[PDB]
Amino acid sequence: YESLTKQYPVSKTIRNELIPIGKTLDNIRQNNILESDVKRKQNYEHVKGILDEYHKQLINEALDNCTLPSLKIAAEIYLKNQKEVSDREDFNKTQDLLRKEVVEKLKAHENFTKIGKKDILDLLEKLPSISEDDYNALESFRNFYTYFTSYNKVRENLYSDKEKSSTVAYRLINENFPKFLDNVKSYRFVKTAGILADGLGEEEQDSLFIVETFNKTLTQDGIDTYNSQVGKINSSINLYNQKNQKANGFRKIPKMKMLYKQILSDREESFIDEFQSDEVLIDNVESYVKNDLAKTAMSNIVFENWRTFDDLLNQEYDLANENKKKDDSCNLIENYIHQISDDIENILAKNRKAVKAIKDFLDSIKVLERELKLINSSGQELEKVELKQVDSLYNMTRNYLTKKPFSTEKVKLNFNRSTLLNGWDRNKETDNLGVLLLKDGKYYLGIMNTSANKAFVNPPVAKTEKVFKKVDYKLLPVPNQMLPKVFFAKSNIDFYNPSSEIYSNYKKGTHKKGNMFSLEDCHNLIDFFKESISKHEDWSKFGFKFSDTASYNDISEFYREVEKQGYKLTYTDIDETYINDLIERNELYLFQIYNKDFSMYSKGKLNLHTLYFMMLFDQRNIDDVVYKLNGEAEVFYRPASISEDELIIHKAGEEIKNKNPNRARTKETSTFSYDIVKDKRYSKDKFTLHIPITMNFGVDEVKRFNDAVNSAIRIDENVNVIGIDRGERNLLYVVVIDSKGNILEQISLNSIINKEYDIETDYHALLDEREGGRDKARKDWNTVENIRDLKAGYLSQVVNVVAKLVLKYNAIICLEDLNFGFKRGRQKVEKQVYQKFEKMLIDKLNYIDKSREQTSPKELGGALNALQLTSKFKSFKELGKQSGVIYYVPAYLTSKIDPTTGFANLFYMKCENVEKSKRFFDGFDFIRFNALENVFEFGFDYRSFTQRACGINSKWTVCTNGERIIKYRNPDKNNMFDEKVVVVTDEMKNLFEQYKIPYEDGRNVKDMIISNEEAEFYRRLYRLLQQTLQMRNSTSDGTRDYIISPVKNKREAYFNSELSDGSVPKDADANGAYNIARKGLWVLEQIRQKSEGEKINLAMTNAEWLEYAQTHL
RNA sequence: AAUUUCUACUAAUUGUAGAUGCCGCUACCCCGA
DNA sequence: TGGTCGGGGTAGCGGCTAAAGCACT
DNA sequence: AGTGCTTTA
């Protein structure tokens, strides 16, 4: 499995730590960044609600009020069967948004705001603010490096693929017209809204047949006009919705109309305009006739009852009168809350009034909205008026904590250079302000001061032999763009004439995508590029070796060859004393980096991320196709969190005890030094970096899952398979196997152990009893352990275990499916944390690394070339397919039950009627009894059962022997139950003695039982019949294992889990893991059966699975 | 009870063993004061 | 069941982005 | 005769 190595350009962002070195307090202000007092954020009442609010004008004065409304502009049946046979993929385009130029009509108006042109947001005041304590008019701050592609322009594509299901400006026309073709295929006499709308009497629209400018719902008036009034009238009326019949209540949750949820620009942008008095203004100042009704209590300020008159009317018949469920008219029991919305006869009429009296008044109308319940004004009036137009902006007034990660109004400050760190190339040394440097071992970092940026352009040669080595590099970005950018600029055209024919060819674009042309002229263009780069000196410093003239790289291949060669790092000696001589002038912000790892006596193994950063500048290695520093690397300061006083800590003499068993025993004193210990990471200030990384830079191929597995598929080196399962006693018991089902491991991941350190961790009961502690402590207050953080850490540790197993035994991972599977079901892990375990196991299997103090990195797990075992995942919808080396198989009717009979659920369902029970018995061949082993054995054949193709060969004779510890129900003493049957046999000898039947003849005693008729007799016979087959034991507290299949496995084995043999699963969930492994080997055989890049589906049928499980020997 | 970040660690020790894309685009969900 | 406020996550939704003209004071 | 840069490409 030596393929799959650096076969996908993965990328990461190392998050390292900074500490200064030298003086490192350069500036007179002592900030060293000058992001130390922004002051733009405290008392933000002047500025709040300006930019994002005037986005409302920016959208309103640009969108097209009168679009091309006609759905019939396509002029097409679509698909009603009244058309020609030849579709020719045109009808699906008619379903699709085949129009193009409505965006062109949208963008007709540039639409700058009343307050200011873009220049007010682009002119550099070079200040954090201009506003004042009294008021502000055109407040702004400096530009901060390309807001355009990032913050505000994302809102300006509404008919596009923005990947959010609310900007519904074209999915409405995409969906409603197919729905109307359905509504004319069938007719609307099944829906309730056609006539429940006692008035309008329509499902959605005033007249459903006609088209309409549905974007009226998108604007300020919102979906209230579309929905809210008929929502209000929807109540206990229409008793046939509450009294079933052929229609008008065809389902319990119909709600037959909906326009899809409010657009991104809605729930947003309350009312305010450019005025010379400022307000925080979270509330509707224009007009709050809105009422988000929530109709339970009226006059709750001055009534104090959650239901107004229901509280007054009665208190006994609220529960004394029987509920509606068993005793089914809704209009007499629930119509109270529908007639409760008695409308207020009048229209607190108030606006933002008293702010001018003193400088500080904040929230008048917000307090009015808070204290007053919704105004009960904008009702319904039995017909769907523009009532409740301003719920859409009260929806800004509420939930304002939810929507605001980043607009352009709140970007953070940094060094006095917007482009900080955008590129650390040779030529851009002067402007990008960044410089890399390092001594031996300690990795330094330099940032030039703004005053003397050009001071570093002249490094004098070495004088003293105290080096302070400095690193620089050189590259060539985006060669699709730089190559046409250079040699076609008007300046370089003057400095070097190109041929007019080639310029004409490129301007018309003969050589671009989608054309047949003279390949010799394409070669002429390529030569023009090559020789005009030969003209250069800065570009010519690169060792560029492009292709040959016999057949040159295509233009995409040309840019690939340009990009992959274009990166070279080097270094030059610098006098340390000279750095000391210059830093006095406050001209260079120096830094250096370390963490837990960089310390020689700290011999312990490295963190994985300090290995990458350390090996990045491994100057002895070229790092040609290995990690390359790239892109912006913005820094981040945080302040100190917790004080030393709050750090409660013992002084010298802290011989405290160990929490762990087997180390609280051996070393209870906890021998230690007296550098007394505590988490210090929050005890001080901090500086942090982000270094983007393109691990496996320059790799020339992105591939797929079949590509990411088929190399293993031809020649195996992987045949083993990991099983995974969960259960009660073991949380996540795992089982690996071999090709032919030989179990090779039985380790419970409840227990893990540091083998190299070779001291037992006793992880069992540090897992199960600790999560039990969380279970019994989380009910009343938020425990220290989050509800899933311990599971996250445990699964994180398990990733190392499974990765080591994969690399040791060659085994491939075969986690259970959760799509072809049916239920959600009772589970040991509640919210499908197993799903994010799949995600984590993919995410790490993108790349184990040793991460030790010294390395010889030329290895598969040597941190140079990490094996990319699985390609990246896209979606859980994409899951259910083989994610590289993480296959999936279903898990249903086999997670608990061995397949030897498998009828844990009885082959028939439970019997109630006496004659049906008799018929159910009559399929049996013989019910018998032998007093030797006391076995009251039975007999039956497969063919006489429902679903007579599900199983295969149910001719086995279910026996009855051995004890069972089954979970009785004997609720006499408040849900008591007998913990066991004494033995499964002999509990019905008394039942036979009730009739005194000759049960020792060897006859089919059934012949008498059909003649016997007693309800309790057959009820108890049912209980013992289901219980003798209950082959999994309900393990007690202080668990005991008994996997006891009544059918013999040819040797009276019963797969008895009390035994010690390895092939026998030790526990029930271990047997389930074994079953998942046996499905895993089958799906691997299914894959091997194929012989092309095409692969059959991963799924299984229950019949086929039961067939193979029967034929597992 | 030590970190750069998270779980758990004491683990010969101002540390141990294993894991992680930071800013960022706005959305859904699912049950609930 | 449209009835209102969540409430915290879930999943598919920018990244893994760096030189050169060019209009510049 | 020009440094900031938003532009491109």
Author numbering: 3 to 289, 319 to 359, 387 to 405, 426 to 462, 475 to 937, 940 to 1205
Published text:
Cas12a is a programmable nuclease for adaptive immunity against invading nucleic acids in CRISPR–Cas systems. Among the Cas12a orthologs, Lachnospiraceae bacterium MA2020 (Lb2) Cas12a is the smallest in molecular weight and recognizes a short spacer (14 nt) for cleavage and the creation of indels with high fidelity. Typically, Cas12a exhibits a bilobed architecture: a recognition lobe (the REC1 and REC2 domains), and a nuclease (NUC) lobe (the WED, PI, RuvC, BH, and Nuc domains) for cleaving nucleic acids. We demonstrate that apo Lb2Cas12a assumes a unique, elongated conformation, whereas the Lb2Cas12a+crRNA binary complex exhibits a compact conformation that subsequently rearranges to a semi-open conformation in the Lb2Cas12a+crRNA+DNA ternary complex.
Of note, the ternary complex contains an RNA–DNA heteroduplex of only 14 bp that mimics the cleaved heteroduplex that would exist in situ; this 14-bp heteroduplex is shorter than the 20-bp heteroduplex used previously to study Cas12a orthologs in target cleavage conformation assays. In our Cas12a+crRNA+DNA ternary complex structure, the REC domain is rotated compared with the binary complex, forcing the REC linker (261Leu–273Ser) toward the 14-bp heteroduplex. The RNA–DNA duplex passes through a central channel formed by the REC and NUC lobes, which results in the expansion of the central channel. Unlike FnCas12a, the REC and NUC lobes in Lb2Cas12a are not connected through a Nuc domain stem (Arg1056–Asn1066), which permits flexibility between these lobes in Lb2Cas12a. The 14-bp heteroduplex is not sufficiently long to stabilize the DNA-REC2 contact through the finger helix (234Lys~244Gln). Consistently, the 14-nt guide strand of crRNA is the minimum length for efficient cleavage of target dsDNA by Lb2Cas12a. Finally, in the ternary complex, the PI domain is rotated by 38° and lies closer to the PAM nucleotides of the dsDNA. PAM is recognized by the conserved PI domain through Lys575 and Lys518. Rearrangement of the hinge region is also observed in the transition from the binary to the ternary complex. Thus, our comparison of the pre-cleavage binary complex with the post-cleavage ternary complex reveals that bilobed movement drives the structural rearrangement of the ternary complex.
